[model samples]
Target chain A: SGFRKMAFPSGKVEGCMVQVTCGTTTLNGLWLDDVVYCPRHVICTSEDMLNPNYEDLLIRKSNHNFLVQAGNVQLRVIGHSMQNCVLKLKVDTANPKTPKYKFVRIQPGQTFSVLACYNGSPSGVYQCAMRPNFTIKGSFLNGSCGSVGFNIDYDCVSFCYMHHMELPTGVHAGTDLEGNFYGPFVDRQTAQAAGTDTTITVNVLAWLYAAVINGDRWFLNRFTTTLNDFNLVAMKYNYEPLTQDHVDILGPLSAQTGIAVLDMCASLKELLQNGMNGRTILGSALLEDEFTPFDVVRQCSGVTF
Target chain B: SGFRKMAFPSGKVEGCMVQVTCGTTTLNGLWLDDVVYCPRHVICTSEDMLNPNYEDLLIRKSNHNFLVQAGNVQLRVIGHSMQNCVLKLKVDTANPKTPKYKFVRIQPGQTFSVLACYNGSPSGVYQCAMRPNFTIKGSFLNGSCGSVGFNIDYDCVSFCYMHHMELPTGVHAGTDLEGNFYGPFVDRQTAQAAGTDTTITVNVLAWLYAAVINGDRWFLNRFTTTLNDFNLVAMKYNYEPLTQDHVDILGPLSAQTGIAVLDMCASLKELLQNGMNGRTILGSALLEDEFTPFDVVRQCSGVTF
Candidate 1:
């Protein structure tokens, strides 16, 4: 199928004329099963958006909505803008001999939607995959039954470029699992948090630590959120490791940085020790509803520091 | 949870009947779901039972049926019989870090049944486990979801043993990717012929080989069917990798063991050269449409002085 490209710069477009022409009709008769719209922010709408909660306009109530102009303050129904975002299905039974996959890559910044339809080919077992830089919008509906795996390799290239401008002389930033800058760790948690978490924290900490970290100085600062928030947030808050933007690039180039995935296990181990100490000193308040950050952290800012 | 025990050849019996009892009431009020009783070579009461196609079963069934018996089955339907089949499920959310799981063990030759009245309890998840034995009869009306793994394991073990019995000396039989035993690598083509497809084949062969390399031969022989088949058959063959049995466990086992799971890329390279040409040319004519045994010529049996 042909590729459609859309470039969105900073939340706004001139004349606000956002329209996309999809690829050739020959490629797919059914709705491309998966979509790629990272909804810069989860939106607030009557309908359940992919990221849920949060607030963004990309997810209109229905395909009937649109934005005629930037300054125009009217909720025009933009029939799923997400539809133009481009969607695809990938069924991978990748073991040893059979590592088969079917993928359709949608262009960046493009918007698209998945229509409600049945995959009534032969037998109804259909699985799918969408590339990086996109988020799954809603539950897979209409189909009978099957599995779906979401995967993508995203790059913080633009992020690094913009980041480098501020710290031209070089600044110290966090490191990723690979001990590289830029990534902190290329994971779901951090990717979602990067623009929000780091920006907010750096803005606040700009008063104490330097407002930026880059180049050689970033190496030392390249610690995961674990190093910074673990003691206070109980490590569970560090949904992703920390690294400067450059590490994302360097790690792949040298294939040196970036450690294996360390997840809830590390959080639990450290939490266990604290739990033990909590029991030893002042028996844990052990309330059934005694605020589990792991659960509660879903909220923005998640209970202060 | 008092220990339940039964001894064979205990001299404290009278009459021609054996008085077997449990030490506790936990296993009492058990209901055996789908207990089918019929004579050997007996035709099924329903046309659905006569041919018992797996593909249709998977494509149409809600979940696999759980028939308890073919005939002459006895039951206490007590605790599991394999004593050491322990499963661990844990969820750690950082704070108040606590571990949760109940240890489960099965004893040898322990027979149990199911009773529908015990609705609220976890008994619904329980199934019989004949240690080193590879067969289970479950009833569909009583069987629910989240269970199918046990049946496949048993089926796999049975196939493993069949091959082992056919091999010579210390050389054991090996399974294909789908879970059918190819043999001690006596020849390569047989290994190549094991899997019907690429994706699932290697898994069957790999795990089968793992059983041998890890010296888990007992588990290998005792596990009758591939996990895929065991689970799929109940899902009415609606599941991928589905097959049926009248306690005739070979076809599904072979289907599951079709592919050869190489250790890695290097092992794959080795097999490529040896597999296609070296394997004896055994025709699939008799073996087609059924899991019947046909001609075989292992290295030891393939060529003679």
Candidate 2:
């Protein structure tokens, strides 16, 4: 389902988070605002297609649980423009929104990026903040996605993201394919408080390690270039390892030339027990998550993180 | 398998009636020269694809079948150009004959025509003989199939044929979709003998009954038009029903204007027991065939055979 044209109680053009209570059946979906948004699992038959105002009829996060309940509940898929998926509906109109739609696709357990090259070719690519709900905050699209996408056949669709901004809360640190820096950002209130932006932290080690475990290609590529970039500065220091405690004291590397953060590690101790404060569910941890307080250290070596 | 391009003892470029002696599994195939010709069931592995002279190594009727034994043998398919089927082969050659060629297609249980129309358009059409090998002796095709097919997207690929000439031996009577004449012809030798051309028979009634049992379209079409034409002459005979015996005494209706054969029937009593002399297997008899003899009488009425 997409956004409702109406507003939530907050008088904001936003919806509230709602949970699905159901069976052991599993689903592939996205989580936004700390709420899951698996679009494909929803059913919209031909009869539903005739309804003129689909947005009103669509399930929204703000709806009461009574309105959304169905006998069987399961998460299915996340739909977005650049996502590689197809929606098979018997259609008669040219406008897609006119029909009730459901996108069926695979929801990879890692963040990915869409580098739409409106101008084409590049040796260097940048990162876009990835969100848990499968919707992107933005990528280095420069502007409209059509610029890069239309320029190069939907551009390169790669499963790689630097910053994973889990909705309503969590954030993590990482690097782009070209080793550009990302996220240490926070929510508006957190930034305004001037308190340590507890929402931000650097954690690419667990991500890289998991990808390597699965033998993913993009991770392998990112792994190499990241180390290469970091090694330049590491060697200057005799290829020694450092901790995030040390990096924070050093601040932004604005002073350190030829240096990059290649990997991150932290104690997976008890706090890993709560799933980054529920930014993810029971599964994203124990399975998908690796973020923790940046404590562990690394050295410039053959070891991947 | 294809023709060996060599000669049988008869000095004719022909293959033999083959019997695959193996398992109890059934197969869909064609009967020609009184032998089965199901092509799709055959397997051609990559190793076999390399054998330069596929035609020579191919299994044929005269091979003593010593070359054709396998742990399991079942008729599979009859490969022909117009047949709708696909073969998945890893290939690099342009010539289909270069690699071992096997056609995978459905072996329909009736006679059909291929109005290739090297030239185009006509209301009235003609019938070429239909052979049981899932191929046509010829249809109304003026010449190359491309003439009509290319003109209209492979033309109409409708399943309709007029004669089911089982290979190696048996023949049955039928009419084209256009209500044109088909076989009264016999095997070359049988025709030469001219002794009632023993193989020749007008048995549309049985064929129509079998098709109606399955409710086939081509049968329905031919049935309508055939009756329409026959009604023209039956009334002239005071709306009487005639027997093939009567027609034979009347010889070819070359003298009777505006008349066509509408139906034919005969006793399914004893001979229906042996399956047209093994032209088809156990099933084509109990389930598919109705071709007995042209003895039944019929009047031009709403009554279908």
Candidate 3:
């Protein structure tokens, strides 16, 4: 088994280009830097009243993947977050520099990029932080990661929640004979991405396809009429279940876009054909048992150049 | 081949029954009924509904070995509600009074019960009306279905639209879902008074199962709560395009709840012989195409029947 929080490095394949292809051709080519793991809880209502802006919870992307590795060894890490909290990452094992990273002051729905790299000097440690924000989270030295040689492994989660985004994702609802009213439901695209030493490409075909499935062309025709009514309704109404007919006519049509990049500079041996790397071996020294890259789920599941 | 909307009578074996006796006491009894046909619409919508009320149908009872003489006998009809309907009678071709009988009605969303018999009569035509509410838009009838001579073969589509009903069917505007919101789908059932007859049953269960699989119980609990608010914000809220949570909950539940009754009246001859005598062919029919019973489906699929 693998020791907790050990980083698995992607073996130096001598190849420069990291090949990542978008699964579907219809979607455009823009992508966020790192796959974002965001879970938000919006207050649709203020008091006991129904919030006019409150809609339904949705998840747009269902299929997406990420791969990241650094050096000669392999290690794994887990990240978690809740609404309104800064992004935080912690190393599973003790490292030389005692690296720690934290991110805060994040907006409700915004995008950002991040990168992870190791300093040249063996004396220097591995480091990660937000790119534009330059908010560093962790640092580690050569021997700090393991005995001698090692690598780190990581994966990014992209476009975590889009379907849950507010209206603008689709259209509206209508009325039943009972005269019960309802709102519209929306759809979002699926995301996909992979990385190599050279480059990484993100794909969002599922998203675009979902958009079309949501009555896009038809929505365009009703745009002006719906928009005007929605504006008025928002202004006058604060809470209350709209008629099923009214709700049915309206649909979700918007979502926050995001991307992410993961750094793996710890578990190098796991990625290597030779065998387990030294860094991982040293991390296990404290665990009372020897472990291999196969012991790590990320390393076993991750692909390397 | 069978003629359009024509009834034919033939005698072969009566109904079939099976008894399982544990020791002295019989544990269970299995009965089989004959098959019958009328009309069916492949697809139902809102524009035009289909139905066969009580007015346009008729029926008759009979004994063995009747005299034949085209106009010699004017049989005393037992059942009512029919006129000018053509039929091929097995009671001596020479006699005109002994004629075949037919059903009274066929409607959507509800089931109908019937009791038919064979009698010795001549030239007394018994009339029957089918699909009174809707038009006989389309149909497919089999000739001497399965066995020869004795077979009830006829198929006529009552109507095309569910819109005619007090409630609507199929996909509509209000909920934004791809299917209808209110009213039940239509199905038909029949049996004979002779030896034994088959009984068919239907219920919604698969969709209910999906709720448990996808945490649907919780979603619906919350979703319904929001809807109960009946405020503007609640009105803005919708349940579609359903989230992974929604799909997760619905898929299994839907699979479980989408149960229907069919195939019980396996053969016209069988139904007339067995079903009429309170015989049941539920097992074979269920194996062939009918839905599992409420209790069976509930226990096996982990859903309410």
Candidate 4:
């Protein structure tokens, strides 16, 4: 017969089965009534198991179906069966005795997620386990994985971290979560009635405010036009021409906010200039219009202000 | 014979004198009262003038004694007799029709001061005149300078502008002129009584608050020591260990101000790291002790949080 009939070493045990070899002298001795059993990698429970090796019994195969997404300098773990697990990565596995390990927690099979940082080094080898306690690869009871290593692309990680971390957390001045929008202009009726020649200070300040807060170059061109417009309107009011003094007073919350407005202006200039250069390097493939030197010079006044 | 007898042409005119040629003929026309005169240049004013090239008469050889000291992004005119006059610099001398002339008023004698800024560029051969009104340099009542030329060193001007423009205008967070200070922590008693298990949360947040408000690196060292001291104290209090949640709440004005904690930490870390590298490049000449790798690692935990 191809299959060898095997029984529990004991005469009668409930729902008990053991594996038996057919070659040479048959070898069999295991009671698997209460627990699960695997023939090839046999590991038995606490009692009635010959030459018991319980460590193998507790060890379960780790589900390596995990994906790592990095953002805000943190690694987010995703997949099925990830909960209640301790994920440890080696800081430097060169010397096992002195090697450092960082731990993170996980949740499995639900609307659950786990997040942790790589402790500053993005590149490293990692070994994970279901249980938290361990010392130099021995005396651990739980699920484990074969060592896996990856060389984290620092640039990619940095870009991802900045891109995600920069997600605006506060309310921006122009638009809100709802469809409502706010801008620095009076209604047509209000504007007409306020013939006191209301300067385009509102327009310039609002747009520059966006530029300063977000460091976006898109607002820079608008800033130059609005600056010129401000002067035109101010001339009608017989107001003093646009000057650094005017810009100083027009900063966001000029008196109390305590932000370095001029310094911020320099920052805005650098950002716009860099962006312009970046587009140049990317060339026609970027599918972007060019920002000419003239544009930069025009925007220069806004920045100096 | 060397001293020619020069007299007023008309006997009737008051305070008048004329120059005579020792060689043959004697021509006379000029006022002797109230001012000095030179052979090369002559100007007359206040009655007793003949044939009156008084346009040339009032044009007293412009005492170009003025000095332009650049400070605070402004050209500060110094020296005597700067008052009651307007200082004008032509933006483009070549095109008088469109040559924009920026003018600033001078305060003559008493604490005399005059200030103005070139409209961004310090090039293109400026033609300066000190008169109040004129189309293309013809009829003006007050003052004038023989169209002088100066190569406005744009680089020099920019350097001066930035150097002076950096003057801090508002009160920083650390200290103000009124002997007031702003910081994250309370008084010493509260800090001491707080106990030894000081979580990195307090230490990191407080130091970062100091960093954002003031970029003083010396204070940063103090901050690190204070952070360690806080942890030591918290240990006595059986303080709860620090977690990211704590940092999320302990940011600069977390409850009121919208600035994020981890963001500030990153900013602080960058600032400090740059400072360390700067000092390292400068070496012992910088006279600063090293911020050991160990130091950075300890602070790294703070940043990660």
Highest lDDT: give the candidate number. 2
lDDT value, residue B128 of candidate 1 = 27
DockQ of each: 0.00, 0.00, 0.01, 0.01
lDDT of 3 by residue, B162-181 (tens): 11111121111100011121
Interface RMSD of each: 32.0, 37.3, 38.9, 49.1
Off by over 4 Å in 1: A1-305, B1-305
What are the runs in model 4 whose C-alpha is more than 4 Å off?
A: A1-290, A296-305, B1-253, B257-263, B266-305
Cα lDDT for residue B217, candidate 2: 18
lDDT for each residue of candidate 2 in A1-305, tens digit (9 for 90 to 100): 00000100110101111222212212122222222332221222324423323243333322222122111232232222111111112112132111122222212122222222111111112122233333333322111111110001011122232221222322232233222223333211122111122111233333323223222312122222333444344344232234455346323321222223333222222222222432222112222222211111111011110
Ranking of models by lDDT: 2, 4, 1, 3
Q: Look at candidate 2 and tell me the lDDT of residue A45.
A: 36
Q: Residue B84: error of model 1 in Å? A: 23
Error in Å for residue B267 of model 4: 7.0
Which CAPRI level is candidate 1? incorrect
Q: Model 1: how far is A300 from its true place, Å?
A: 27
Q: For candidate 2, give the lDDT.
A: 0.23
The digit string of per-residue lDDT tens for model 4 on B17-132 reads 22212122122211122221111112332232223343343344343322122112222222112111112221111221111111222111101001111212110111111111
Candidate 3 i-RMS: 38.9
Per-residue CA lDDT of model 1 for A151-191, tens digit only, reads 11111101110000001111212111111223222211222
Q: After superposition, how far is residue B215 of candidate 4 from its true place, in Å?
A: 25
